[PDB]
Amino acid sequence: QIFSGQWLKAVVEQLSCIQGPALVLTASHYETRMIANQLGEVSQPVYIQKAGQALSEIIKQYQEKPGILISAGASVGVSPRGENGEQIFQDLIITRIPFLPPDR
Amino acid sequence: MRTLNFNGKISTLEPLTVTVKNAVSTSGHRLPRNGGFNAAPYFPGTSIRGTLRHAAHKVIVDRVGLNADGKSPFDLAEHFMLAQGVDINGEAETFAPGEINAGAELRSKNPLISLFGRWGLSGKVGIGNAIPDGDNQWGMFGGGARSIMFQRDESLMEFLETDQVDRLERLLEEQAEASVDISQIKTEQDALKKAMKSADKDTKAELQIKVRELDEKIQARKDQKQESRESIRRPIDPYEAFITGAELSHRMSIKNATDEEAGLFISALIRFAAEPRFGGHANHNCGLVEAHWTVTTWKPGELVPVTLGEIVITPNGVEITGDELFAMVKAFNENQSFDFTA
Amino acid sequence: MRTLNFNGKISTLEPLTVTVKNAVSTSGHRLPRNGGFNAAPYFPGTSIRGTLRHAAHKVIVDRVGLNADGKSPFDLAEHFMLAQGVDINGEAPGEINAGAELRSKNPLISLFGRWGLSGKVGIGNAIPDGDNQWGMFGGGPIDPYEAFITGAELSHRMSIKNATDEEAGLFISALIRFAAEPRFGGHANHNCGLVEAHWTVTTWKPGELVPVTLGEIVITPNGVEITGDELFAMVKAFNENQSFDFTAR
Amino acid sequence: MRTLNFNGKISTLEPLTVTVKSGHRLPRNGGFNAAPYFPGTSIRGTLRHAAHKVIVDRVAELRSKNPLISLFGRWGLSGKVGIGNAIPDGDNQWGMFGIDPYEAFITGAELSHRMSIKNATDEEAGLFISALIRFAAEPRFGGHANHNCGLVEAHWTVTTWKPGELVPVTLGEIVITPNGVEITGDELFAMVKAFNENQSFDFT
């Protein structure tokens, strides 16, 4: 489980090129932590899902101030929709397809 | 060039302990286990071999003798080669041409290196691990706790000056507030510990760094404490040791040992019997043992080994049986052809 | 520079208990057990070692002398060094040979070492000879504490390794002063701890096949009998040596 | 500052019964089949009551203020005094006497007994001897009040030992008996006078 640095640089580069609120669905909370570390928070607030956290707290952290939300796992049929209901993230970055580990 | 098998038992006169760096962990001092967590702990053959090698080195420096001032003729390099087995001047190479057929002559001139070997010269003696005969036979000893001398007895106040009494009281107060500070630092530490293991991969790396810096903070508080750099009244970690009287089966063997090398080994055991100490915690008199070894030889090609005698080490003395062992000791003592500087 | 093994028996005039936090459990003050659950209780060598170390400390501060105010010239750091070996002040390759003269001028810290300084004396665990010499004492919902019985024979064995005449005399004097209050363990109330003990001090010159007994030291409530002119010789050698600086480390 | 050892004998003129506080047996001195002993807990309790009611009759730094607490001590404070148990000398000599019968030593029993004061000063160490003399008025070494178990006589050889010397010196002989209290040794009398002359006291 080592992520190649070139891919990290490319991913942060494409993340920073976004000009609006976005939802980054990484695959592992470990990927969430490495991508957060590699990001320089040049963009509007970066909200990170700590390993074993609760998504809805970051959801309501994100409604007050839309920005870039890197939340691995999560989903399970959820959506960071606004208060009256509107698409508040024009971009959705699936960094890697969440390929399941091999299970001997 | 006869192979001597010293098969015998070490009975533990005082608890037998050893701190093997692998065996110990942050859980606590544990004896080196004979495979796995729950196996029967053994006393390492490395410790016995080192003790016997230092005994043989002392034997050799005593037989060579001392000058009027009491300094052995050997140098630091020769001492380290004889007992420690490490070369100070770099004169030890493995599998190098030129030393072919020089090993026999060096062994004859230097029985110590012959027996215990050096870097590149195979040691003729192998000092096996001590395996207990029966279950249990190991447990936690030492322990106890350091305490404030004057809190345990008050007669020592009448010896300490009022300024020293002030220093005492300040030492107490400071050690106490530092103890509660370290206490809450440890509470944070253990809280971290709970996640150090339960975690995802390289998430925990950060927690490793956190504990490392919390331990640097601990050191900082140590420096802050003033006076004692440590905690005076602290509990002592118990150390695992074999119970007294414990029977530990021991198998040593000397591969193709001349009568001279065998005599040096036996004299080494004789000198070791003066202080029959193995392992550590000598402050608690740990390591004192009485040991009886049946020396048996096995001529290659023969189906059975013949017993050349029994060597019994006891607090009451060293008992040597069989004329073969006596002839070995006499051969070693009489031989004046030993050069320990090569 | 001889190795003196003190081999002998401790007979307990009153019970003898030690609250070692390792053994004590929810049952109460369990004696250290020398094994598993059903092994034979052993009186730790750490307790006897502390008692004899503090006896040596007391004789050292007595032999140094007391000022007119009745106070000892040593400071707190030096007291803690002598009895507890704890570096209160906190002050190596330069120490490789400093141990020789630090031992020579401070016989106590040589005998009972400090952190990084190997102690010459090793005080072992007292172990009962027979069986059923341990029971519960202290009846009074009050925790009964484990302890040995009156007259229990505990086989003890100390050993001083490469000690000089002053070192061995210091240890003998420490035993003399301990025999004034021959109390081991704790439980000062209930008078538990007081023992009468006797040791045959036998030495063993390395190389010799059999050790030679320098004599017997016997501690009884009616006195301390020192047999063997050699133990007296080491005692007076320690007493008359006026060349001990106890302010070095 | 002398550490006083009271080595001596307790002779019993009545069956002493203890463990008043499955059957009523005496505490076992190891195992079950070994000799019995009379627990020092009750002896030190009696000495506690004696010291308490002598200081009532009359009226390190703490030790000078309260000689009682210096002798026996609170939880935090180490008490100088320690009262061991009474061990029988010979074989047998104890029986099921006496309603559930209780276990007791026969009349005429002689027990070897040890008491000690660590680093005693004459001031507070006099209090212990005064506690034994006023004990002698009411010699109760039993656990029964209706059956008045506890009538004993006891003779203690006080042996101090200044540390360092090879032998201890006998201060004197303290005997307690229903006839009264008998004391020997002029220096023991002077010790108890030291106690008397000071008046340092505090309540508990």
Side-chain angles (χ1 to χ4, degrees), chain A residues 1-2 16 20 24 32 35 50-51 53-54 62 69 83 91-92:
Chain A
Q1 194 91 22
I2 197 74
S16 58
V24 187
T32 309
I35 294 297
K50 310 309 302 306
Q53 203 247 342
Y62 179 104
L69 165 52
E83 76 295 1
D91 308 283
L92 193 154

Side-chain angles (χ1 to χ4, degrees), chain B residues 14-15 141 144 146-147 149 157-161 164 167 227-228 238 243-244 273 275 282-285 315 318, chain C residues 21-22 34 42 49 67 70-72 75-76 79 83-84 86 88 122-125 127 157 161 204 206 209 211:
Chain B
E14 286 291 346
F141 292 78
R146 259 202 277 135
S147 308
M149 314 170 288
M157 299 317 338
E158 286 74 357
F159 302 149
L160 272 276
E161 283 288 342
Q164 298 302 313
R167 182 180 184 186
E227 320 182 46
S228 66
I243 59 91
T244 299
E275 176 195 353
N283 59 352
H284 309 157
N285 206 23
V318 171
Chain C
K21 71 195 81 77
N22 313 137
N34 200 67
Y42 77 97
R49 181 167 196 79
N67 59 6
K71 316 293 286 192
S72 75
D75 69 324
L76 205 79
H79 273 277
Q84 310 279 115
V86 301
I88 300 299
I123 285 156
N125 304 352
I127 289 153
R157 219 188 294 271
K161 183 286 154 282
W204 203 332
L209 267 65

Side-chain angles (χ1 to χ4, degrees), chain C residues 66-135:
Chain C
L66 284 295
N67 59 6
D69 198 5
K71 316 293 286 192
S72 75
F74 302 151
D75 69 324
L76 205 79
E78 284 298 328
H79 273 277
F80 267 111
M81 199 58 12
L82 289 173
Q84 310 279 115
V86 301
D87 278 299
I88 300 299
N89 56 2
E91 267 77 18
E95 207 75 38
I96 188 67
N97 201 2
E101 63 268 26
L102 173 53
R103 288 185 162 77
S104 184
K105 77 179 82 75
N106 188 350
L108 192 141
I109 205 78
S110 185
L111 207 65
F112 314 86
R114 58 146 174 80
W115 151 250
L117 198 75
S118 293
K120 278 179 187 170
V121 68
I123 285 156
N125 304 352
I127 289 153
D129 292 44
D131 166 330
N132 280 341
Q133 287 177 124
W134 49 97

Side-chain angles (χ1 to χ4, degrees), chain D residues 21-55:
Chain D
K21 65 208 145 171
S22 63
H24 204 91
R25 275 297 321 279
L26 258 60
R28 313 304 301 120
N29 187 247
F32 208 159
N33 80 9
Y37 73 93
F38 173 61
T41 61
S42 58
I43 308 175
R44 169 148 171 151
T46 53
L47 267 290
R48 276 278 290 191
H49 171 273
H52 188 208
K53 64 104 176 187
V54 64
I55 65 164

Side-chain angles (χ1 to χ4, degrees), chain B residues 86-99:
Chain B
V86 50
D87 56 342
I88 307 307
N89 54 20
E91 191 67 30
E93 47 184 348
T94 44
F95 320 119
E99 282 72 359

Side-chain angles (χ1 to χ4, degrees), chain B residues 151-287:
Chain B
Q151 218 291 325
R152 279 279 288 97
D153 54 4
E154 299 295 322
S155 47
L156 276 67
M157 299 317 338
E158 286 74 357
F159 302 149
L160 272 276
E161 283 288 342
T162 185
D163 59 349
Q164 298 302 313
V165 172
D166 189 4
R167 182 180 184 186
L168 186 278
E169 195 70 65
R170 276 175 283 132
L171 187 66
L172 261 289
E173 298 298 318
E174 72 87 12
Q175 176 43 45
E177 59 88 28
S179 79
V180 299
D181 179 37
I182 297 297
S183 77
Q184 51 86 357
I185 287 280
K186 287 290 205 318
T187 63
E188 306 330 296
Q189 212 77 96
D190 62 50
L192 258 58
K193 170 61 175 68
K194 156 57 40 186
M196 218 139 60
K197 307 305 206 187
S198 65
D200 294 300
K201 184 164 182 176
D202 172 23
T203 53
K204 24 185 75 61
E206 303 187 313
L207 211 159
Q208 315 326 334
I209 304 304
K210 284 199 288 294
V211 57
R212 290 286 179 85
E213 55 80 19
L214 265 170
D215 299 337
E216 306 332 306
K217 292 286 186 303
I218 286 167
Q219 228 74 11
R221 183 55 173 228
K222 296 293 194 68
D223 292 338
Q224 169 263 28
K225 275 170 59 49
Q226 197 50 230
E227 320 182 46
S228 66
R229 307 258 63 73
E230 304 297 327
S231 55
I232 296 97
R233 182 154 76 77
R234 65 169 294 286
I236 298 153
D237 184 8
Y239 59 81
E240 205 161 5
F242 303 96
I243 59 91
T244 299
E247 297 291 348
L248 302 141
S249 192
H250 203 227
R251 277 220 170 70
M252 329 162 208
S253 75
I254 326 180
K255 181 172 198 325
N256 284 114
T258 59
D259 284 12
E260 292 81 4
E261 294 155 5
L264 171 68
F265 194 65
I266 295 159
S267 179
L269 299 166
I270 289 164
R271 186 174 194 95
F272 150 83
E275 176 195 353
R277 180 151 280 100
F278 284 138
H281 288 293
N283 59 352
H284 309 157
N285 206 23
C286 284

